[PDB]
Symmetry: none
Subunit: 35 residues, 2 copies
């Protein structure tokens, strides 16, 4: 995703997202079906 | 770091990580602060 689309899907910046624990990044990404 | 701890931290096996270009390996390590 572009950064703009990333924000639209996840309601946060890619940078903020990368601050989450990996299991939670995956939990949110794999919720959005993006794998 | 065990193989499983590595997979826990990076979200992929060592074998997958090694098949990323060096700069992306570095990008992930400099995200993880390692």
């Amino acid at each position: 995703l572009s950064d703009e689309d990333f924000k639209a899907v996840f309601g946060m910046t890619r940078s903020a997202f990368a601050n989450l624990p990996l299991w939670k990044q995956q939990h949110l990404k794999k919720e959005k079906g993006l794998f």
